[PDB]
Structure formats: structure tokens, C-alpha cells
Amino acid sequence: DEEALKLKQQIEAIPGNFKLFKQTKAQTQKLGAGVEVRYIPEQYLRNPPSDASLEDLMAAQAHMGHNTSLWNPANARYIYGVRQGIHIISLETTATHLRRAARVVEEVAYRGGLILFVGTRPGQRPIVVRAAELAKACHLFTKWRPGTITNREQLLGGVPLTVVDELDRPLSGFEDHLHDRRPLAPDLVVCLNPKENMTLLYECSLAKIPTIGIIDTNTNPSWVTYQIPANDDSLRATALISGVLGRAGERGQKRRLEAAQRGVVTWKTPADVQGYFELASARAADARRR
Amino acid sequence: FKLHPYARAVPVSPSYFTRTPRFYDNYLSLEKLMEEYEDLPVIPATAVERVAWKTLEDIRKELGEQVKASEFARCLALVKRLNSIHPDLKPQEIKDVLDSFRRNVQPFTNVAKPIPIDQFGRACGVGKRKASSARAFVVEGTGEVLVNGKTLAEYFGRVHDRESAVWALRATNRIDKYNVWVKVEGGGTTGQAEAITLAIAKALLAHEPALKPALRRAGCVTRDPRKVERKKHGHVKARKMPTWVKR
Amino acid sequence: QEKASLIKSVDWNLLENKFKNLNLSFILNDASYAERNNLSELLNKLYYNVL
Amino acid sequence: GKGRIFQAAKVYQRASEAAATNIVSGLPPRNPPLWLKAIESIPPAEINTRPYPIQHSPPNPRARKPRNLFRPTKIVYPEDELRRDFYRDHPWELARPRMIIELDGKDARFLDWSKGLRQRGIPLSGESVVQRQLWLME
Amino acid sequence: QHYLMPLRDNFEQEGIRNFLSPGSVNMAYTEYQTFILEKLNALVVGTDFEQKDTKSIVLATARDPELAHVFNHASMAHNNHFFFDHLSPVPVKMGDKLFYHINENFGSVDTLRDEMIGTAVSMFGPGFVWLVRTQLPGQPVALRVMATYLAGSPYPGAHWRRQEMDAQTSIGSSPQGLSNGQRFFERSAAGFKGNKLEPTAPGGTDLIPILCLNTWEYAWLREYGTGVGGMGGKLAYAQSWWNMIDWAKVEEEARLETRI
RNA sequence: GGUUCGUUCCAUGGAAUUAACGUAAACCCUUGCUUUAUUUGUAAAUAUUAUAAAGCAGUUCACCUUUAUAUAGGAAAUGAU
Numbered sequence A: 001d002e003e004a005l006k007l008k009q010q011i012e013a014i015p016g017n018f019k020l021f022k023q024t025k026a027q028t029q030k031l032g033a034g035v036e037v038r039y040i041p042e043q044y045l046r047n048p049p050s051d052a053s054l055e056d057l058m059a060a061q062a063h064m065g066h067n068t069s070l071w072n073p074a075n076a077r078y079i080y081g082v083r084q085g086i087h088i089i090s091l092e093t094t095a096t097h098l099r100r101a102a103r104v105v106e107e108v109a110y111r112g113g114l115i116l117f118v119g120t121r122p123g124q125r126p127i128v129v130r131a132a133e134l135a136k137a138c139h140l141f142t143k144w145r146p147g148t149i150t151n152r153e154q155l156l157g158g159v160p161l162t163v164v165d166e167l168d169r170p171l172s173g174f175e176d177h178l179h180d181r182r183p184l185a186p187d188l189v190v191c192l193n194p195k196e197n198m199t200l201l202y203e204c205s206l207a208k209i210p211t212i213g214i215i216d217t218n219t220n221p222s223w224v225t226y227q228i229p230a231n232d233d234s235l236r237a238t239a240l241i242s243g244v245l246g247r248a249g250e251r252g253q254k255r256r257l258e259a260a261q262r263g264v265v266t267w268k269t270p271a272d273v274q275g276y277f278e279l280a281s282a283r284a285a286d287a288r289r290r
Numbered sequence B: 001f002k003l004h005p006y007a008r009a010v011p012v013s014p015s016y017f018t019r020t021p022r023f024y025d026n027y028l029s030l031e032k033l034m035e036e037y038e039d040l041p042v043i044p045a046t047a048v049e050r051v052a053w054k055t056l057e058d059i060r061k062e063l064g065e066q067v068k069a070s071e072f073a074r075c076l077a078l079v080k081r082l083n084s085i086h087p088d089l090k091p092q093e094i095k096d097v098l099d100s101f102r103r104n105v106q107p108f109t110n111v112a113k114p115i116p117i118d119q120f121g122r123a124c125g126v127g128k129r130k131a132s133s134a135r136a137f138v139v140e141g142t143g144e145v146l147v148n149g150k151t152l153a154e155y156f157g158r159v160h161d162r163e164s165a166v167w168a169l170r171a172t173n174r175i176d177k178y179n180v181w182v183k184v185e186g187g188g189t190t191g192q193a194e195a196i197t198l199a200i201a202k203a204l205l206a207h208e209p210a211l212k213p214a215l216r217r218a219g220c221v222t223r224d225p226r227k228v229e230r231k232k233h234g235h236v237k238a239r240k241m242p243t244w245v246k247r
Numbered sequence C: 001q002e003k004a005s006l007i008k009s010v011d012w013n014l015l016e017n018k019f020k021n022l023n024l025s026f027i028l029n030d031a032s033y034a035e036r037n038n039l040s041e042l043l044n045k046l047y048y049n050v051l
Numbered sequence D: 001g002k003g004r005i006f007q008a009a010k011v012y013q014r015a016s017e018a019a020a021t022n023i024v025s026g027l028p029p030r031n032p033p034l035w036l037k038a039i040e041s042i043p044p045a046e047i048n049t050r051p052y053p054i055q056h057s058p059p060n061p062r063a064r065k066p067r068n069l070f071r072p073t074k075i076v077y078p079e080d081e082l083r084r085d086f087y088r089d090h091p092w093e094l095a096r097p098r099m100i101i102e103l104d105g106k107d108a109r110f111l112d113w114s115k116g117l118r119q120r121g122i123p124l125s126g127e128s129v130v131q132r133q134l135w136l137m138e
Numbered sequence E: 001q002h003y004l005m006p007l008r009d010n011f012e013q014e015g016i017r018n019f020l021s022p023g024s025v026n027m028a029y030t031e032y033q034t035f036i037l038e039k040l041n042a043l044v045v046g047t048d049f050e051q052k053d054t055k056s057i058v059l060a061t062a063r064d065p066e067l068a069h070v071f072n073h074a075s076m077a078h079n080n081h082f083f084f085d086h087l088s089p090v091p092v093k094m095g096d097k098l099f100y101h102i103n104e105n106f107g108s109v110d111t112l113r114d115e116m117i118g119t120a121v122s123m124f125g126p127g128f129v130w131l132v133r134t135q136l137p138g139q140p141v142a143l144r145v146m147a148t149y150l151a152g153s154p155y156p157g158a159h160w161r162r163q164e165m166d167a168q169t170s171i172g173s174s175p176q177g178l179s180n181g182q183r184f185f186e187r188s189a190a191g192f193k194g195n196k197l198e199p200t201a202p203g204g205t206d207l208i209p210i211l212c213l214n215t216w217e218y219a220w221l222r223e224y225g226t227g228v229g230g231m232g233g234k235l236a237y238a239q240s241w242w243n244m245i246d247w248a249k250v251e252e253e254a255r256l257e258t259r260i
Numbered sequence F: 001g002g003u004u005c006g007u008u009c010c011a012u013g014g015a016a017u018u019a020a021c022g023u024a025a026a027c028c029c030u031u032g033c034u035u036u037a038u039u040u041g042u043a044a045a046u047a048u049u050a051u052a053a054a055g056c057a058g059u060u061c062a063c064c065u066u067u068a069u070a071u072a073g074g075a076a077a078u079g080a081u
């Protein structure tokens, strides 16, 4: 039966009508009147804000804590009151702590530090990956493997590294170093759900690594160095907080690379690479006489 | 020649601390393409050419990572989604990344050679049993059967074995259509009888290939691989053990 | 990668699969290439020749 | 105490001390971590201290030995009494779907209840009657 | 919320030369489009249509009988702006390509003039007269004249409200009357059951409105008066309109594939 | 917590990441098929028993069922083989 032929015409007509459909769309779509678009779900990723206001935080549902019964009474310092059977986090407290964390993220990126954004909940992968992209950092959206910091030789043994200068240009002549070197640990960890991964945060406490976390009404605030009291169960509040910290890192990386063009390095060679220079000159000093 | 004064080690990939760096780097690239070419039209799955995508094992070996089946199952749903894009409208970027997920494995081909028919119209079939091997030459005839020159009754002194030797012709009701000239060797009475069953069945299919569905249900196509088990040291026979004394 | 298995696929580079008819009367008889008559021209395409 | 000892609030103090001197006595200390100077002047905030929470309602004056002093209190407004009155007289007004999803949190910037029930940005709902009632009643 | 957008060439300030006074276009667009948008806002203030566009509200509220009142304000705002958006401050010379199809389809540009103008008066009711571009998958581009009623939309995705034939003077016992009556129930029954009468292409690329003529009284009653005595009126309004058409833009939106 | 002949595989754990041995795989005999060889074995022969080197083959395909959608299982002389 030729009933499949006319169906073929449909598959052959898609390139045609599609081009025509897209053209006519740009003609009669925005004629009637203008619309004031105040919210788009994809706004926190496409164009995150540099700073969060009280209205942005409240609209993102960052003030909705957990049930009053499931509360860590230690973090009663950030709670504004009780309503709808839950604890309300003070909007002023979330804003102040968020502007402070943004400074930490900006300075660590300004001093050439390695940052790690960690959001493991289901719908947090696009958020963490976007934040790490802006700040030129690392991302983690799956279950943290216990020991990736305190036991980095086993877990991060064969992962490749590279040596770069103040302008992030790859330097040649460190082949012997990169082969015999201890794997890297993050200089800053931004956790979007501390309650769910305390193994990661405890290794940062042992390794002396500063950490930033979203502390919900039931989360222990002693697990991170810099707390951001806010609702960690909302993907709208997590995208705003993460986007604001991503802009902080981006704004810090811009200053670091601008100072480099002027010949001003905002950091010093780490101790790991520093020692390599010493023994490297020794091998040159040995051959100096011989 | 001297090294650069300012230098610091930096991870190459952004997925440095993840479980599988190389996998996520490739998975995030698909997420970026899908999010970019989501508006392009698609084609119903019925009109999508079937492709043999790689397996979870081919990826583990290729990337040298211990990828998870659940995380790979969702990475496979993207390539199937992107593959559904219209070919003409499909960008060159998606065409290339998809070619890296194709599985170009070809199974080995082993086709048996068909049994010919001699110029005199006789086809030779071969059957085997416990220790016997038969060669049956089936020809258009009246129903005369010879086994090593002797008649069917002068050779098998057990009617059960006679019916089993020519069971293929009996099941298909063709005893009076062909003449068989069998030549058996080795084995015993029942071993040779069942060996001729398979021999005539194969030779018969050379004349009328459309009888295999019937010889199947008759049980004349299957080769019975049962064989005497060897004697094993410490045993009286293949499996019989000597008397075990507890005290 | 070491503990990874191998999928059995036909290797068409093997000399056994590349020529399923090993008789020179068929290989050198203008089968695929244009005028590869000389048996040497055929061998040079298969093996590494030091000469 | 099953919990572990988290010293996250003292990463700088611990890291700065380990970097003060060199383990090989007689040599200058190596360069510290790159994050040490970044948060040099951004100390952590005080945690675990229990303050007197905001009192959204007057505390019981007759109480002589009050308990739950460090417990957050319930937020109550004069409109709560009004909302309960309206929606109890109009139960099927709850069947009209209402979108509590916020757009930008700037709804209260265009609400002038001296005009009427129809405002900008919000739909005509039982909330409009409560806000209009409260304005007239005050 | 939906806000009023400026016009093409400051018509609100100066208006058209010899088609509408600045005061008339003010009462026709500013003092009316704003009135419609105020009512449109109240209907979508707390619904999914709060941030959607006018045409998006048209196609989304076409068949739903519980949103017919929302369709009117959304379709009216889209149709009204579509009318002023195709007017030119100065007469434009009709392009060659468009000048060919009009003659091939209608016979002559002057024939198309009387057909549209004749349909505006022959309709005797506030509506819109459209110049539709129909092109089936197998057939070529063909131009025709479609006349919609109070707020009907020409787009195929909103055929549910393609109000193009009154029922009080078109459905009767006469031979032609019964035919119209049959088509009436055939549509209502087909639309209700979900069946489609005229197969259309995906994306609504079948009909592409190019030109429009707003015949509502608020656009001409003030300028051209009632029309008693043959002077002015709805007739002269349609005539003067034909001189200010933006044939340059009309030809553009038409997208007449070049085949000469 | 499921699943498997199986610490097999999947998911998961506020701690795991890996190594060796056993296991498994592979090997030997056996089963079907392909190529090679034909005496001292084979009635003849246009090559089919036997002999013995290498290679291929299965739970493969079809059907049915299928959890948390992640990993699968069942049916057994009347699907193929």
C-alpha cells in the first residue's frame, strides 16, 4: 500500500514548513501588546544575578524552613518565627550571610584558588555545572566518594593535572613533576546540601579546607565555615544562591587575569611546586660542576 | 630555558573530583547539545533507522572508567533523542558525536554446506549415535532398504530398531517413495539404529526440504549428544563409589 | 581496561578473511585492483617489504 | 557523643599556625595555601548561641517561671482573624485555584487598597476582601 | 501585565495624512487598546496567561468555551494592532511580485479593492477583513479574502473562532440556506467530537494573514461620521484605507516564492 | 533492598578506594559446522565414514513476562536451531 508514501511526504515537508513556521513566527508573535515578563524558570541559569535582594530571596522560597518539630535548636539564631507549621528563616539573615559568602568565593578565585561546587540532589546538576563554569571551578553532582580528600592518592591517582602560569597558560617542563605529585585538593568547597553529605564536609574539616553551605532549619551549622541560612529543598532558591556565588567567582577570576596582564600576580607558587624548583636547580647545580 | 617563576598545578577537566571524570565530560557535552538543538523537529520512532548503540561494557573499556548502569541508561536516552532529529536539519555537530556511540561489531558467519544430489539422484546423509556412524543413500524407489548389504530384517533382530532406523520415512509417510542403502559402522544395535534415523532424515531433506518442520516434531533432526562417561579413579564406575566405611 | 573483556568481531584485516579464495588464478585475475598482475605487487600490499 | 568533632570554624586559625614555621627547623616556611590570604579578613560568624527570639506576640505577664524562652514564636497578623471569617462564610471560594508561586516578590509595590478590590498584579480573591476590609476598618 | 506599545510612525502624535486625524487614531488605538488591555489583565492576572503573548492567548483559548471572554480581548488586541501596523504615512508603490499574484488570483488590483471594500460594507457588522495567504503542501501560494466577525481570528489554530458567517441571515430553509445550516452543525459536531474537517499542516502555515481592515465603529465613526447622504461614512473609510496600505510590508510578510 | 548457578549484577549506606589467591574465565575430551590433508584408513565416487590440525557456534534469535525504571526472568516433543 502507498499509504507510506504520503507519510514520507510528511518527513520530507518538515524542513520546508519548519523554515516557514519560524519566519511567520517572527512577524505576528509580538503584535497585540507587550508583556511584562517578571519571572522565567531558566533565569537563574541563563543570567544569574550578581546580588540577591530580599525580594529575590523571598520569591525563590529561601525563607521556608522545615517543620518546627524537625529543627536543630542550635540554628534558632536565624529563625524569624513560625507559620504554616514550619520555621521561617529571616530574610535579612539569608541576605547578609549570602553577601558574605560571595566575598569569600570572590577572594579565593582572586587569589588563584581551586573551588568546588557540590550539589548532589536530583535536580541540582544544571545548577552546579553552570556555577562552576562561571567561576572556572570544579563541579560535583553525584555521590561524593568517601576519602577523595584524606585518601586522594588512591581515588585521584591517575587523574591528569597541568601546570599553568599567572595567565592560565600551560607551562612546559613539568613532566617529571606531574608524574610524581600528590593529587589536588580544593581550596574552597561550596556545598548546596550539607545535610546529605557530611562525609565531604568532615574531610574538609580534617584537611583544613574552608567550606560554604546552605544551612536549613534542621542542618547542623557547625559543619561548614560560612553558613547561608536558607531553604535547601527548593531548586529555585538553590539556583539563586548558586548563581550568585557563580557570579562572585567569575568576578574574582576577571580581576586575577586583569592584574596578570599588568604584570601583577595575586598569588605565590604553592609549596608543592615550590619544592620542585629547589630540587630542580639542585640537579642543575650538580651538573654545573660536572 | 629556566622554568617560569609563577606556576601552580590545575586540574585539566572540571570533573576532577567526580567518580568518572571522562564519562561526565562526554555526558555534559550531550546535555549542552540537547539544550541547544531542542527546538529542531523530530521524526516518529517508526521512521527512525535502527542503530546498534554501544553497550555499558563498551563504554567502560573505552573510557577506562567504572561507569554506572543507571547513569549510562540516561546518557543513552539522549543519543536516542538527538538521533530522532530530522536528518536534513541535523547539524554536523550532532552527526559526529553520534557516530562515536555506534557499535560496529559483526558476528561470525558459519553456514552449513547443502547436501547435493548425485547425477544418479542419490543423496548421502550422515548420522551418529553413542559410538556409531551411518551413511544413508536415499534414492527414488519402491521402498527397499539395505543395511551393510543385508536386509532390514536380516540385520536388526528387533522390530523396535527397524522402525527407528526408518522413522523419518515413516513419520512423513514416504516409506514407499525412496530406496535407502545404508552403511553403518561401530556401536551397537540400538546405537546404529538411532544413527540411521538421523542419516535418512538429512538425506530426505535433500530431496524435499519442506519436511523439516515435520521431522522436527518427529524427533529425527536433533543429534543426541549423550555419550558414555569415562571411568574415574577412586570410583568403581563413572559415578559408582566404593563402599565407604565410617568407623 | 585490562580487566575489560573483548567482543568477538570479524577481523577483515586477517589474510584469511581478506581473501576467501586463495588461488592466484582468481586473486591476480583483475578482481579488485587494476592490473596487479605481478605476484610481487600483491605481496607488497600484504606484507612489509624491506627491499 | 556519636557526633564527630567539626573544626570547620577554625580552618584559618589551624592553617595559619601550621604555615607560621617550617617543619625543617632552620629554614624559612614555604608558601601557605592560596586560600589563606583570601579569607584573612573574613572571620566566621558566631554559631550555636541561643538568643532571645523575636516576640511576635506579647509574652504572658502573669507567668512567674516562664519556659521556652529561647523558642521562636508564632507569627500572627490582624488579617488572620479576617481570613478565617471570610473563607468560612465562602468555603467554595477555596475551590478557585490560586497561585502562591512568587514571580519577583514585588507584588506589594502596586497595592493601594484605598481605590478598591481590583489591584495590579494580584487576582480578585478572598485576600482582596480582607485587605480592603482591613483598610476600611483602620 | 500587558501594556500598550507605541505605534509605527508616531501615528498617536500626528496620525495618517488623509486617513485618520491624530485625535481619531488616539481614540481608536490609545483610548481603546488601553481599555481592552485593562480588561485583558484582569482576566489573566492570576492564570498561566499572565506572561503569555496576545497571539499565544488567542491560540490557547480558541476552543475552550469557558475562556471565550478571554479570547475576545486577546484576539481583539491582536487584530487591532495588526491593522495599524500595516499603515504607511505616505502611499507606497506596489511591488512587482505582489502586483503579479494579485492579478493572477483576483484578476486585477482594482478587482481586489472592490472585493475587500465590498465585503466590509456587505458584512454590516464590526469585524475584520483579511487578505489571507493559503498554500497547501501540494498546491502553490494562493491569495484570498477572508472576512471575520466581531473578534474572530483568521489563524488555522483558532478556527474554532473563525467567525466569518453570521447565523441570523445565512441559515434558513431556502436552498442555499439549508446548505449553510448543514455546514454549521457539521462544524459544531466535528469540533465537539474532536474530528478535523479540513486537514491542515503543522504549525498553522496554511493561512498567513498579510493585510487587515478594522471595520469596528470606534475606528471610523468619529472621523468619517455616520455616512448619511453618501458622504464619508464606512464607505469612504474603506476607500481612503486602500491608499495608505504598506504594500512594501504586505509583500514582505507574504513571502511570495520567486518562480518567474 | 532486590537479583544471580555465583561477593554474579543493580541500587544504596553519616566511609570507603583498591590488591593478591580461590571463584570466574580459559584449557582437555565430547557435540554441530567450515577449511586443510588422503595412506598403512575409505565399495564406488563428481568425496559422504575414518583420521587430526586450525577456526566458528547458544540462551543466539523469535515469543511471553518484567521491580525502584536501575540490573532481568520464564516457557522445554509440536518457534528457529
Ligand SMILES: [K+]
Pocket: B228
Ligand atoms: K559402562
Ligand SMILES: [K+]
Pocket: none
Ligand atoms: K570429519
Ligand SMILES: [Mg+2]
Pocket: A066, A195, A216, A232, A233
Ligand atoms: Mg531540607
Ligand SMILES: [Mg+2]
Pocket: none
Ligand atoms: Mg561498597
Ligand SMILES: [Mg+2]
Pocket: none
Ligand atoms: Mg575454575
Ligand SMILES: [Mg+2]
Pocket: F039
Ligand atoms: Mg592405499
